[PDB]
Write a protein that binds this ligand. Structure first.
Ligand code: HEA
Ligand code: HEA
Ligand SMILES: CCCCCCCCCCCCCCCCCC(=O)OC[C@H](COP(=O)([O-])OCC[N+](C)(C)C)OC(=O)CCCCCCCCCCCCCCCCC
Ligand SMILES: CCCCCCCCCCCCCCCCCC(=O)OC[C@H](COP(=O)(O)OCCN)OC(=O)CCCCCCCCCCCCCCCCC
Ligand SMILES: CCCCCCCCCCCCCCCCCC(=O)OC[C@H](COP(=O)(O)OCCN)OC(=O)CCCCCCCCCCCCCCCCC
Ligand SMILES: CCCCCCCCCCCCCCCCCC(=O)OC[C@H](COP(=O)(O)OCCN)OC(=O)CCCCCCCCCCCCCCCCC
Ligand SMILES: CCCCCCCCCCCCCCCCCC(=O)OC[C@H](COP(=O)(O)OCCN)OC(=O)CCCCCCCCCCCCCCCCC
Ligand SMILES: CCCCCCCCCCCCCCCCCC(=O)OC[C@H](COP(=O)(O)OCCN)OC(=O)CCCCCCCCCCCCCCCCC
Ligand SMILES: CCCCCCCCCCCCCCCCCC(=O)OC[C@H](COP(=O)(O)OCCN)OC(=O)CCCCCCCCCCCCCCCCC
Ligand SMILES: CCCCCCCCCCCCCCCCCC(=O)OC[C@H](COP(=O)(O)OCCN)OC(=O)CCCCCCCCCCCCCCCCC
Ligand SMILES: N[C@@H](CCCC[NH3+])C(=O)O
Ligand SMILES: [Cu+2]
Ligand SMILES: [Mg+2]
Ligand SMILES: [Zn+2]
Lengths: 239, 59, 49, 94, 74, 265, 76, 47, 524, 64
């Protein structure tokens, strides 16, 4: 969920989206390691068996037939095989058959985020709105991470659906938490919809991935997934 | 050889005659402006004041 | 020098490497599947106390 | 009309019926059995390219720096290239 | 005791522009308030929907514009 | 002489107009920034750089005319190459105005929620697309017909009526730019208005600037034809002018249709 | 012929890169700083013991990286 | 002038050519690794 | 006075090529100094040498990107090798339209001055390589740095348009006699295709940044959210330029590599028509996909699917090209000189970069990997390795020709090995960090990512050693007291050469041709 | 068929004059002496000085 020192590959998954992403990347990498090793082998054997001391005669062939069509066709079926899963992932990730259970606007201000779980208020003025500031260097306890810990984190009920409406107020931004596999852009004019559904409790960390002005990378995002009873208690207490 | 020159001469003369008539039509119109629209947010924006700031060019 | 033999051995090595990587991926997938399976129907929880 | 210099020379040639650089297209039949496959050159030695070919076969292109005193045969398609100066034979840069 | 529900998944907007979703819900609520006014049930429904959808800054700015008479669109 | 050069292509002689024009461009750009942001030397630097570019361009075309008309260095092949280069330049300009049209369309097919989801934005009094813009289209259409008349003057050996056709075309182009100026002054909305006004004015302004440069090209060709520099067989300057003017007319036709007809609907 | 020279020069290049790195980022011949989170040398300790049980705002402490670290609670 | 020369450069001729080319390449490198550093130095010399 | 005339004034396509080469070397050194500064800042977590002022760091990344993507590869592929070896190779006298050649080259240095002054004014341009609108807006910058940078892009774009028109008209008109289109070598062909892309795409970038300029200063609303005009419009326009822009930095590399492999395998390029058609198709399909750079912004599903398919289809022809090159080494009589070393390294590392690109081309994978150092590794392998290694290969292969001297061989191989090791160490951990999930363009990173960035920082210094070795090579070449021979090099001694440019002289005389070549053209 | 408003022998005289000098292209004629050694030269000198002063002022943030 959090970044690890000397780590290879993706972080851990807490979303069916991220499971799909891991599987798709692994299929792609399988096909492409096959491609790369085969190309390296053929190049090496071509360079080494004809190294100016075994074959000093150019052997003069320039027109080839029935092999050019073969390396035109076989990469095509390779691409078909590595594009069968990607399309399935796209068209099984787009659909939201179920209704979202909550709605968490994530307004990307200039160098700090804000959130509003507005769907709990009888009035028009919104209750339950706060700001997500990065904790400075000297305001940390002995354990937390650096420039990635946040005051008053995002709270979310676990094992129940979500719908986060990314948008901005000053400049381009991006809501990006990798452990959930969520990345989208907050453009000052539009209201992007992300439907996500966590599967387990715990905290997940992420950062901004777009050039905001100067405190870029100091504008982090923290999402907690907690039990539904505790989420209810927290919301009722925060109102 | 010269028939083409004569033909395009004729149609260009027709063009300028019709255009002069239409200019006579368009002119002599008073052009009274209607009332200014309500100040919607997207009208008359000033992100950075012009070098000749207060009013836009051609006003 | 035999062109077909070289291409055959290249394809075979590519498939061997892909099979090794796929075995890795299958083991990782099994670990994830059993972890979540238990997380629903087993002793494993996630909150410490 | 009005013209002087290079365009004047070009148009005088195209009015007299002669082609100015007709020596720059050899266009000869392939090979040398008893008749050399000849080119023409305004200088002592000149670049010539062979694509070869009776009309069906051909090799892509080979550039050889043909010279006067020595006929040169194409490396791959093996035809002679005998040169015949139609100008003052001199080193191309004097 | 809490509600734990929000705006539904609308058939009209399967894309990622809840900007259009926001504007549509706002217009429907104010069409209520204009025409019916006493359809309090359905129009509280519409009100809850656009409150859940539209960000607070947008809602406040649009309400002030509507009061000022400079609200683009219906 | 060609018989010693052994090839009919053109070999030019050194001229400092490349470097001088580049220095003029640097002057224009730094002056542009220093006038865009308030500074002491802004306006004078921008004007000096702009007239520098004008001067270098003038002496450059003068040098090309001098060579090709008096020295006679243009042979058939370089004559063809000039046509090639100018067609490529027109293609580049087509792509530029395509980018501008894309900006307009991407801003006007699906209008955002913040201009009412409608087009044109409420409170922008769109020009009637039939009073002035129709007259401008008719004027440019007659100008194109007059350019074709000039071309058939040059080709048919009648080298006297060519100046008459060219002067008629220049008069029509001036009438067009005058009416465009009248439209700008009588505009019921300015540039700093919504995306509608913004894209309208940017596209129309660049089209008018292209009209100015095409008109001045035509003026140069008219002076040359009056002086006798053009002949039935050998004339590329006029052909370039004709192609450029046809380009400007076609761009105006697309502009009129899309913006004035559709945008007002 | 030259493999001696090539290999010797490669090793010398690694040596020079190491020396420049050591002077520019270990002793900072060009001014700079080092975080308080790395010089304490006990921060990673607590960071790992906290991956065992990460504190939370609403709810008891909860684990992070459950799969890739194989750390998680039992029947309760 | 050397339009009619057998070699466009004819580099051998100049005066020992060694100091000249050495200074040329070293000044090329100096201009390549002086301005990029100088920009940062000036920015810190500012606010 | 005669020397200043011959340099500042002369048309002489060869001399303009020499000037382009000198400018390319200077710009490359400047870009590498910026890259080393970036690496020095990123060596350890915390503030390393910038001591704050992350704005200056963003300025540094922007200036590095511009310097090396506009002033190093383009002035060396097109202006450097193009200007020289298009008319010499095609068999023609001095290029068509020489004055355009000169004006383009002398437009470039004022563009350089604008870029540096943009990096130097009141605060700086901290907007990244791809200037995005809202950050480059007048509310968020208000400096003028972005104005200067935009004008720099205008000058560079105008110069490249002039050069592209030059090359297109030269190839279409200024060929020799008898030489059909299908006998011009692949370097000429790649320069033609890349010139078409440069002519068609670049004006769109000029329009987009003109629109950005009039949005900043003259107070329009093209990219201001209030009043329509979303920033997505600018994303679309800039990237409709951007991808044709990146299939231009590598096509001359492809041409040079084809020539080098052909001259080292003792045999010409296998499947010539295949090469030509594949390269034309790469050029064409470089346009039909432009948003595969913005998958994570909010396009609908069908556009994402279509751009996925388009990127795969553009992947196929590069495969045809690489397999053709592998085929045209099956002949024999190879000889491992430094140009062959660099061509082989090009093929290998460009293969790695291309496979990573494929991984990135999908939609969901780009959702997970957008704007993380995975993308940086992808385009640093592709662009740096491919373009720069092709550049070095061409430089050795043809410094055999320009100056007339020849480099020392052991130093050439030493430089190849140093640079290969350094620049392949310093960019693979970028793949690993991108998988881990660190965002791109950040001056500080969490403590977790500090493991590799100490190792990658160890890679930049090796590349600096390599570049210094390269300049030692250039100086020892320009002062090598031993001219071109047969023992040194076997290329120019050929009495029969596949390419026309080797059988002329040590340097070309002044007109490159006392008399044009011919072609026998049989079947009388 | 009519020659355009000039005898066309003035052009022939001018052709003789231009082909009968021994200089580069841009220096032929007495007009071009004045033009192409004084106007662009002084103009570029003034342009260079103003460009330098402008870059200096913009960089230093003086003389707003
Ligand atoms: C031309 C393309 C090019 C090249 C060659 C390089 C070279 C290098 N780049 Fe660059 N880089 C970019 C293009 C390029 N880069 C771009 C476009 C970005 C994006 C910026 C952003 O995202 O906004 C970027 C960003 C970028 C970053 C991320 C910045 C950020 O995240 O904050 C980093 C991080 O270290 C980096 C590092 C390096 C390094 C270590 C090299 C080293 O390889 C140094 C190069 C080494 C060489 C071997 C080349 C030098 C060669 C010569 C000088 C000889 C020339 C010869 C003649 C012409 C005869 N680059
Ligand atoms: C330098 C030129 C260049 C080249 C050649 C490529 C190659 C490719 N690129 Fe690259 N790309 C860039 C320039 C380039 N790219 C740049 C500059 C960026 C960063 C932009 C930014 O800062 O935002 C980027 C980033 C980038 C992204 C992500 C942008 C973002 O989300 O951050 C994507 C994804 O769509 C992409 C796509 C591709 C694809 C599909 C190819 C393919 O064409 C690769 C083709 C090559 C092959 C695949 C190898 C040879 C093929 C075989 C040996 C045959 C076998 C293969 C198959 C089975 C088909 N590129
Ligand atoms: C046509 C091709 C040649 C054009 C040459 C035009 C030069 C114009 C003058 C440039 C100038 O004055 O720059 C001043 C500016 C002055 O920069 P500055 O404003 O930082 O000056 C520093 C001043 N002190 C010492 C008081 C702090 O020079 C530069 O920016 C240097 C650029 C060097 C580029 C080398 C390549
Ligand atoms: C190709 C272009 C470069 C691509 C680089 C991608 C690197 C990458 O993906 O590394 C991560 C990968 C998996 O990392 P891991 O820690 O195992 O788990 C992470 C979550 N699955 O970890 C690795 O890739 C590490 C190596 C795993 C084993 C791969 C073996 C592939 C080659 C087999 C060769 C067989 C013999 C051939 C002769
Ligand atoms: C195309 C650009 C051509 C520029 C030509 C030189 C302009 C120098 C400045 C002249 C100036 O200040 O003109 C004043 C004029 C507004 O005049 P105004 O006072 O409104 O009219 C009185 C009516 N009651 O305002 C103007 O004329 C405005 C001119 C703005 C030019 C901006 C140029 C920016 C850089 C462009 C690079 C190309
Ligand atoms: C290539 C680089 C080009 C840079 C251009 C910078 C922007 C120049 C125009 C700035 C906007 C402006 O001043 O617009 C004024 C006017 C629009 O009219 P407006 O002010 O709305 O008047 C109200 C009712 N008429 O008029 C316009 O909007 C005219 C728009 C076209 C301007 C053409 C400028 C050509 C510059 C050529 C440089 C060549 C080198
Ligand atoms: C935006 C910039 C647009 C620039 C357009 C430049 C087009 C250049 C066309 C060209 O080079 O034409 C060649 C022609 C030579 O004349 P030629 O036709 O060969 O005369 C034969 C006499 N027996 O050349 C000529 O006749 C000279 C034509 C000069 C045209 C000047 C246009 C100035 C526009 C200024 C805009 C500001
Ligand atoms: C090989 C070429 C090496 C050139 C080294 C030039 C160093 C110039 C210099 O002194 O720069 C000043 C400054 C160094 O930092 P400073 O403020 O002196 O901090 C010391 C306080 N402990 O410099 C800086 O703060 C920024 C520049 C640091 C050095 C960059 C070296 C880059 C070499 C690229 C090759
Ligand atoms: C796009 C804009 C740039 C101008 C494009 C002009 C295209 C002209 C097409 C063409 O072929 O022109 C030929 C002519 C030079 O012909 P030449 O090469 O001398 O041929 C000798 C044969 N007798 O070409 C010329 O004379 C071109 C002269 C162009 C001078 C331009 C000066 C300003 C440069 C742009 C600055 C932009 C700054 C923006 C702020
Ligand atoms: C091409 C050959 C160009 C030769 C001349 C270059 C320098 C131009 C120059 O003298 O610029 C003036 C500028 C000082 O500005 P100045 O106007 O004297 O100061 C006013 C203060 N009351 O001078 C300076 O600021 C000098 C800055 C040092 C670097 C000079 C060269 C920079 C450009 C290189 C390209
Ligand atoms: N020198 C300035 C004066 C006004 C800005 C400072 N008050 C102008 O230009
Ligand atoms: Cu792309
Ligand atoms: Mg992004
Ligand atoms: Zn032959």
């Amino acid at each position: 969920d959090a970044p690890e020192p000397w780590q290879l590959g993706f972080q851990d998954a807490a979303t069916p989206i991220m499971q799909g992403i891991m599987d798709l990347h692994h299929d792609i990498f399988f096909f492409l390691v096959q491609i790369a090793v085969f190309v390296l082998w053929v190049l090496s054997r071509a360079l080494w068996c004809f190294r100016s001391k075994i074959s000093p005669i150019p052997q003069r062939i320039v027109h080839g037939t029935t092999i050019e069509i073969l390396w035109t066709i076989f990469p095509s079926i390779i691409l078909m095989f590595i594009a069968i899963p990607s399309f399935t992932l796209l068209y099984s990730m787009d659909d939201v058959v179920v209704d979202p259970a909550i709605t968490i606007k994530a307004i990307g201000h200039q160098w700090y985020w804000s959130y509003e779980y507005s769907d709990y208020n009888n009035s028009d003025e919104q209750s339950l709105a706060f700001d997500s500031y990065m904790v400075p260097e000297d305001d940390l306890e002995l354990g937390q991470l650096r420039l990635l810990e946040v005051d008053n984190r995002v709270v979310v009920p676990a094992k129940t659906h979500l719908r986060v409406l990314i948008t901005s107020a000053d400049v381009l931004h991006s809501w990006a938490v990798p452990s959930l596999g969520v990345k989208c852009d907050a453009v000052p004019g539009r209201l992007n919809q992300i439907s996500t559904f966590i599967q387990r409790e715990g905290v997940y960390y992420g950062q901004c991935s777009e050039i905001c002005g100067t405190n870029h990378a100091f504008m982090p995002i923290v999402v907690e997934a907690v039990s539904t009873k505790d989420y209810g208690s927290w919301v009722s207490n925060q109102i | 050889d010269a028939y083409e020159t004569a033909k395009w001469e004729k149609i260009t003369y027709l063009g300028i005659v019709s255009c002069t008539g239409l200019a006579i039509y368009n002119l002599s119109k008073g052009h009274p402006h209607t009332e200014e629209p309500p100040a919607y947010p997207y009208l008359h924006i000033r992100n950075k004041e012009f070098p000749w700031g207060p009013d836009g060019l051609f006003e | 020098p035999s062109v077909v033999k070289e291409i055959i051995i290249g394809i075979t090595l590519g498939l061997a490497a892909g099979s090794v990587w796929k075995m890795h991926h299958w083991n990782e997938q099994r670990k994830i599947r059993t972890f979540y399976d238990l997380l629903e129907k087993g002793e494993i929880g996630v909150v410490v106390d | 009309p009005i013209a002087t210099g290079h365009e004047r020379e070009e148009i005088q040639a195209s009015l007299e019926g002669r082609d100015i650089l007709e020596i720059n297209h050899p266009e000869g039949p392939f090979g040398t059995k008893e008749a050399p496959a000849i080119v023409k050159s305004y200088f002592d030695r000149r670049i010539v390219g062979c694509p070869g070919g009776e009309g069906e076969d051909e090799h892509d292109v080979v550039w050889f720096w043909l010279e006067n005193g020595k006929p040169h045969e194409c490396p791959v398609c093996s035809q002679y290239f005998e040169l015949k100066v139609v100008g003052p034979g001199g080193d191309p840069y004097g | 005791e809490i509600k734990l529900e929000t705006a539904p998944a609308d058939f009209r907007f399967p894309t990622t522009n809840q900007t259009r979703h926001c504007f549509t819900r706002y217009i429907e609520y104010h069409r209520c308030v204009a025409a019916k006014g006493e359809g309090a049930s359905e129009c509280d429904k519409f009100a809850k929907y656009y409150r859940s959808l539209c960000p607070g800054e947008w809602i406040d700015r649009w309400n002030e514009q509507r009061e000022n008479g400079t609200f683009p669109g219906p | 002489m060609i018989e010693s050069q052994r090839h009919s292509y053109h070999l030019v002689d050194p001229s400092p107009w490349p470097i001088s024009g580049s220095l003029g461009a640097l002057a224009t750009t730094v002056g542009g920034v220093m006038y865009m942001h308030s500074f002491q030397g802004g306006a004078t630097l921008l004007s000096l750089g702009l007239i520098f570019i004008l001067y270098t361009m003038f002496v450059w075309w003068r040098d090309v005319l001098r060579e090709s008309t008096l020295e006679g260095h243009h042979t058939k092949v370089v004559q063809l190459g000039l046509r090639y280069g100018f067609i490529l330049f027109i293609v580049s300009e087509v792509m530029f105005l395509f980018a501008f049209f894309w900006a307009f369309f991407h801003s006007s097919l699906a209008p955002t929620v913040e201009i009412g989801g409608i087009w044109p934005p409420l409170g922008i009094w769109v020009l009637d697309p039939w009073e002035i813009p129709f007259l401008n289209t008719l004027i440019l259409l007659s100008s194109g017909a007059a350019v074709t008349w000039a071309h058939h003057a040059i080709l048919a050996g009648k080298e006297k009526r060519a100046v008459y056709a060219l002067v008629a075309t220049v008069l029509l182009a001036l009438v067009f730019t005058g009416f465009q100026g009248m439209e700008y002054y009588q505009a019921p909305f300015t540039i700093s208005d919504s995306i509608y006004g913004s894209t309208f004015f940017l596209a129309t302004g660049f089209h008018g600037f292209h009209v100015i440069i095409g008109t001045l090209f035509l003026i140069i060709c008219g002076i040359r034809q009056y002086l006798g520099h053009l002949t039935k067989e050998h004339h590329v300057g006029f052909e370039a002018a004709a192609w450029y003017w046809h380009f400007v007319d076609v761009v105006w036709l697309f502009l009129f249709v899309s913006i004035y007809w559709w945008g007002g609907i | 012929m030259s493999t001696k020279y090539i290999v010797s020069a490669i090793l010398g290049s690694f040596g020079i890169a190491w020396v420049c790195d050591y002077y520019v980022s270990e002793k900072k011949i060009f001014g700079g700083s080092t975080p308080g989170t790395i010089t304490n040398k006990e921060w990673g300790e607590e960071t790992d013991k906290k991956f065992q049980a990460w504190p939370r705002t609403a709810g008891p402490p909860v684990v992070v990286n459950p799969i890739t670290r194989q750390n998680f609670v039992v029947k309760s | 002038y050397y339009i009619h020369a057998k070699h466009m450069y004819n580099l051998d001729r100049m005066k020992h050519r060694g100091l000249k080319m050495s200074l040329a390449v070293f000044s090329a490198f100096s201009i390549g690794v002086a301005v990029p550093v100088y920009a940062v130095i000036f920015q810190q010399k500012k606010t | 006075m005669t020397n200043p005339v011959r340099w500042l004034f002369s048309t002489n396509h060869k001399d303009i090529g020499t000037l382009y080469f000198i400018f390319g070397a200077i710009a490359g050194v400047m870009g590498t100094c910026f890259s080393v500064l970036i690496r020095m800042e990123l060596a350890r977590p915390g503030d390393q040498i910038l001591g704050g002022n992350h704005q200056l760091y963003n300025v540094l990344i922007t200036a590095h990107a511009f310097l090396m993507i506009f002033f190093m590869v383009m002035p060396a592929m097109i202006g450097g090798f193009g200007n020289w070896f298009v008319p010499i190779l095609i068999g023609a006298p001095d290029m068509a339209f020489p004055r355009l050649n000169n004006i383009s080259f002398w437009l470039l240095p004022p563009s350089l001055l604008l870029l540096l002054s943009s990096a130097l004014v009141e605060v700086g341009s901290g907007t990244g390589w791809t200037v995005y609108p809202p950050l480059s807006g007048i509310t968020s910058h208000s400096g003028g740095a972005v104005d200067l940078a935009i004008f720099s892009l205008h000058l560079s774009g105008v110069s490249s348009i002039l050069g592209s028109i030059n090359f297109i008209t030269t190839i279409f008109n200024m060929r020799g006699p008898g030489m059909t289109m299908h006998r011009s070598p692949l370097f000429v062909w790649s320069v033609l295709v890349t010139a078409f892309l440069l002519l068609l795409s670049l004006p769109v970038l000029a329009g987009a940044i003109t629109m950005l300029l009039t949005d900043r200063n003259f107070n329009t609303t093209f990219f201001d959210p209030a009043g329509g005009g979303d920033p997505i419009l600018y994303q679309h326009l800039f990237w409709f330029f951007g991808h044709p822009e990146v299939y231009i930095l590598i096509l001359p590399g492809f041409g040079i590599i084809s020539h080098i492999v052909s001259t080292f395998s003792g045999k010409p390029v296998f499947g010539y028509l295949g090469m030509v058609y594949a390269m034309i198709s790469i050029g064409v399909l470089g346009f039909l996909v432009w948003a595969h750079h913005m998958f994570t912004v909010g396009l609908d599903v069908d556009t994402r699917a279509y751009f996925t398919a388009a990127t795969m289809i553009i992947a196929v022809p590069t495969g045809i090209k690489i397999f053709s090159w592998i085929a045209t080494m099956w002949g024999g009589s190879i000889q491992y000189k430094t140009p062959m070393l660099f061509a082989v390294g090009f093929i290998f590392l460009f293969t790695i970069g291309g496979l990573t690109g494929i991984v990135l081309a999908n939609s969901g994978l780009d959702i997970a990997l957008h704007d993380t150092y995975y993308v940086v590794a992808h385009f640093h392998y592709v662009l740096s390795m491919g373009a720069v290694f092709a550049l070095f290969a061409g430089f050795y292969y043809w410094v055999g020709k320009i100056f007339g001297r020849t480099y020392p061989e052991t130093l050439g191989q030493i430089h190849f090995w140093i640079t290969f090791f350094g620049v392949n160490l310093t960019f693979f951990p970028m793949h690993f960090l991108g998988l881990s999930g660190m965002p791109r363009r950040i001056p500080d990173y969490p403590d977790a990512y500090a493991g590799w960035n100490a190792l990658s920082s160890f890679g930049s210094y090796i590349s600096v050693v390599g570049i210094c070795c390269f300049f030692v090579v250039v100086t020892i070449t320009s002062t090598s007291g031993n001219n071109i021979t047969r023992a040194n090099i076997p290329w120019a001694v050929e009495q029969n050469s596949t390419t026309l440019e080797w059988l002329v002289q040590s340097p070309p005389a002044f007109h490159t041709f006392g008399e044009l070549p011919a072609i026998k053209e049989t079947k009388s | 068929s009519e020659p355009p408003f000039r005898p066309r022998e003035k052009l022939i005289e001018k052709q003789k004059h231009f082909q009968s000098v021994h200089k580069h292209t841009y220096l032929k004629g007495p007009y071009d002496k004045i033009t192409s050694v004084a106007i662009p030269l002084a103009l570029a000198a003034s342009s260079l000085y103003l460009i330098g002063r402008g870059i200096y002022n913009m960089s230093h943030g003086i003389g707003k």
